[PDB]
Design a protein around this ligand. Structure first.
Ligand SMILES: *[C@@H]1O[C@H](CO)[C@@H](O)[C@H](O)[C@H]1NC(C)=O
Ligand SMILES: *[C@@H]1O[C@H](CO)[C@@H](O)[C@H](O)[C@H]1NC(C)=O
Ligand SMILES: *[C@@H]1O[C@H](CO)[C@@H](O)[C@H](O)[C@H]1NC(C)=O
Ligand SMILES: [Zn+2]
Lengths: 195, 596
């Protein structure tokens, strides 16, 4: 019996920023989702069309795990059909989704007295993101007409901005770690099954 | 549709940067007010300099946006708020001169001292000095010497400074496309609305004059009654028909008449509701006081207080090697951080101040969803009004008995109601004429109506017309009397207190009527009534995103300020005063003077 590597996904010394979100492919292992209930009271655990407490009764070709860290108020933007900043410029989910998200508080690990400036997010972009698309570019946004030759100033700003977490913030602004599990079944047998 | 998108993007960038640059300044100020240390002062200064520079640069940049092109009201409101930063849109040398004048005014007010006509050993100051000696003593000469000396020092040393301050401030105001500095102050109440709702900033003078006209009949009677009771403590000094001497009003300037309570008790045999003994017997501390306040607030539908509020806020004197400031304040720091700083103790006054500050925080939490530039109060005096309406319905006998600090079989006394109403009257009604007179005087001086050579000649002339006080000794034009107030020598406006009083009573009547209560208004309580909470939260969550004529319409169902609720509040006292004044004379004649 070879269990799936979930333990190394939900546990990590350092996560990734929202714009440069990580993605892990899980395939050819036996998956026990019952160990996913081994954390503190989950702030968000809601599953779209997969019928939880029955995860152990299905089989899929491969599973994708996407992990990042976002603000408290933005957790509602990791649902299909939503509109905002994270759901439009950083990370967007398709309307026909199959899987679910797990979001839990991480204030005791990602907050410092002077501010944690290692987490960044995108604020300006020309057009929205297609589902499951990653942007990492650092070109200076142009809002006006006069180009500024790649220097910050009026009508052209730096797209990426920091969160700056502190332990004294309110609950809606404390850091939250989010892991999205996406399942898919395809015409290529099926290797990810239950016990 | 061309610069609207640019304005939206610019406002997004400003909102992102301003929160981060403001949290540090607020946190540094908090760390200084709870520590007091040499390093913390430098930290606060270096935190504030960055914010000031960034805000000035952003305002100057935002000046380049024509307002006529924008259609959406919210963005126009944000940009109008951001542009109005003409506090230093002058020359450099004039700015330095004005700053020097302000600093020397503040220093000369803070460091002033008065020496006794007899042996100069005393040479007291204001601090716990002159304030106590003319807030407790009942001797004519002891009060008179101090009152004359403080003026003969401060006004003499302040007149030329105020003379230059007037012209510098007028130049500042006219440089900002205004008419005078009084109009600059009055511009706070200006609002623009769609379906009417406009409040031209020139109507306030008409409004303030109108409402006061309906308060004169009540105040007059009070001014009679107190006069009678002052004829016993100082027998051969007050004429039966005339104006009260200035130095006998229980305070340095006559702003409040509270300290006249001992000599004006109508029924001395009945003591007021004192609950400190019950709190001591029951074993209470500060934490229980604040949990009680939170329970009262949650009983009406408002939300609880965050865990950060309990974790971070200072609630007692630390009793360590740390010096702090014990002035009670409520702090909102941004990013969901709310705190109270209070050196609270076990007494009724602290119990009510807790409700006041907690109401401040409730309003701050309510308007926390709006954009950053609109996270302010709906007006200049809505904050206090919201704060005081909560403390009003917390000292009522019904609420005190409902929580167990009073006997369950308590019997209400008709004689106690009059005493409570009289104390509230001396606290509240006695300050409106003073504020109105002072603001009218400063407005007239700034507008230029009063000549430079007649200032005091007008100041006293219309002092014994509205408030009704006569000077003990004549003052020449070399004097500058109004410079003695802290709210005159150090700037600050003075009309917020006139609007707050009326707003609080309008709100109280609206909420107590919405809670289905019948009886006297001053006995109404809003605890355990969910209907009033939603009506209050309807206005509390708007901030200033909409003109103040709309939040008031939402709550009280009107579009201006009305004094009828205040008249309903003091009706029993009005009837009792009229009954007891039916033999004497009401009103005063502006001819009597203690001097020749
Ligand atoms: C993560 O690490 C903690 C502590 O090392 C451990 O108790 C836990 O079992 C690990 N796995 C999960 C899924 O929490
Ligand atoms: C108060 O100041 C001291 C000395 O600068 C500092 O060590 C401490 O962290 C400050 N804050 C406290 C005591 O809460
Ligand atoms: C009224 O509100 C208070 C809030 O302190 C609560 O303790 C009480 O149970 C409520 N009901 C009555 C009947 O007093
Ligand atoms: Zn207050």
């Amino acid at each position: 019996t070879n269990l799936c590597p979930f333990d190394e996904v939900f546990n990590a010394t350092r996560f990734a920023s929202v714009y440069a979100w990580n993605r892990k492919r899980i395939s050819n292992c036996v998956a026990d989702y019952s160990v996913l209930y081994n954390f503190a009271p989950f702030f968000a655990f809601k599953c779209y069309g997969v019928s939880p407490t029955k995860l152990n009764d299905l089989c899929f070709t491969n599973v994708y795990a996407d992990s990042f860290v976002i603000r408290g108020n933005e957790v509602s933007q990791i649902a299909p059909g939503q509109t905002g900043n994270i759901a439009d410029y950083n990370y967007k989910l398709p309307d026909d989704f199959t899987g679910c998200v797990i979001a839990w508080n991480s204030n005791k690990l990602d907050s410092k007295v002077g501010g944690n400036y290692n987490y960044l997010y995108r604020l300006f972009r020309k057009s929205n993101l297609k589902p499951f698309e990653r942007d990492i570019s650092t070109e200076i946004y142009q809002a006006g007409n006069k180009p500024c030759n790649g220097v910050a100033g009026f009508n052209c700003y730096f797209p990426l901005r920091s969160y700056g977490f502190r332990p004294t913030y309110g609950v809606g602004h404390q850091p939250y770690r989010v892991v999205v599990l996406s399942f898919e079944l395809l015409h290529a047998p099926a290797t990810v099954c239950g016990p | 549709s061309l610069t609207e998108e640019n304005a939206k993007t610019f406002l997004n960038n400003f909102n992102q940067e301003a929160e981060d640059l403001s949290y540090q300044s607020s946190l540094a100020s908090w760390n200084y007010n709870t520590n007091i240390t040499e390093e913390n002062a430098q930290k606060m200064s270096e935190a504030a300099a960055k914010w000031s520079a960034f805000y000035e640069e952003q305002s100057k940049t935002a000046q380049s946006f024509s307002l006529q092109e924008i259609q959406t009201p919210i963005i126009k409101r944000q940009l109008q708020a951001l542009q109005q930063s003409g506090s230093s849109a002058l020359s450099a040398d004039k700015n330095k001169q004005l700053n020097t004048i302000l600093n020397t005014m503040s220093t000369i007010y803070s460091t002033g001292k008065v020496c006794n006509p007899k042996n100069p050993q005393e040479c007291l100051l204001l601090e716990p000095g002159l304030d106590e000696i003319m807030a407790t003593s009942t001797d004519y000469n002891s009060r008179l010497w101090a009152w004359e000396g403080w003026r003969a020092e401060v006004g003499k040393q302040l007149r030329p400074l105020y003379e230059e301050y007037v012209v510098l401030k007028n130049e500042m105001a006219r440089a900002n496309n205004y008419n005078d500095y009084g109009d600059y102050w009055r511009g706070d109440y200006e609002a623009e609305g769609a379906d009417g709702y406009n409040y031209n900033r020139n109507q306030l003078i008409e409004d303030v004059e109108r409402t006061f006209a309906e308060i004169k009949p009540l105040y007059e009677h009070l001014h009679a009654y107190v006069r009678r009771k002052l004829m016993d403590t100082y027998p051969s000094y007050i004429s039966p028909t005339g104006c009260l001497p200035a130095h006998l009003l229980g305070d340095m300037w006559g702003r409040f008449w509270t300290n006249l309570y001992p000599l004006t008790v109508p029924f001395a045999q009945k003591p007021n509701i004192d609950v400190t003994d019950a709190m001591m017997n029951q074993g209470w501390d500060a934490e229980r006081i604040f949990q009680e306040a939170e329970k009262f607030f949650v009983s009406v539908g408002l939300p609880h207080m965050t865990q950060g509020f309990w974790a971070n806020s200072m609630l007692t004197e630390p009793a360590d090697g740390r010096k702090v400031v014990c002035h009670p304040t409520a702090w909102d720091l941004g990013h969901g951080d709310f705190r109270i700083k209070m050196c609270t103790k076990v007494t009724m006054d602290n119990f009510l101040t807790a409700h006041h500050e907690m109401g401040h925080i409730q309003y701050d939490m309510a308007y926390a969803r709006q954009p950053f530039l609109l996270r302010n109060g709906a007006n200049e005096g809505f904050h206090e009004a919201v704060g005081e309406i909560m403390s009003l319905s917390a000292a009522t006998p019904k609420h005190l008995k409902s929580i167990g600090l009073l006997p369950s079989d308590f019997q209400e006394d008709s004689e106690t109601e009059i005493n409570f109403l009289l104390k509230q009257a001396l606290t509240i009604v006695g300050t409106l004429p003073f504020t109105y007179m002072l603001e009218k005087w400063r407005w007239m001086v700034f507008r230029g109506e009063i000549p430079k050579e007649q200032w005091m000649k007008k100041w006293w002339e219309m002092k014994r017309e509205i408030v009704g006080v006569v000077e003990p000794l004549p003052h020449d034009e070399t004097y500058c009397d109004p410079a003695s107030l802290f709210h005159v020598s150090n700037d600050y406006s003075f009309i917020r207190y006139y609007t707050r009083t009326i707003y609080q009573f309008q709100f109280q009547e609206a909420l107590c009527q919405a809670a289905k209560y019948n009886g006297s208004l001053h006995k109404c309580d809003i605890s355990n009534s969910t209907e009033a909470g939603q009506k209050l939260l309807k206005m509390l969550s708007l901030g200033n995103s909409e003109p103040w004529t709309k939040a008031l319409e939402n709550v009280v169902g009107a579009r201006n300020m009305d004094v009828k609720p205040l008249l309903n509040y003091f009706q029993p006292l009005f009837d009792w005063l009229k009954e007891q004044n039916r033999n004497s004379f009401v009103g005063w004649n502006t001819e009597w003077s203690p001097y020749a």
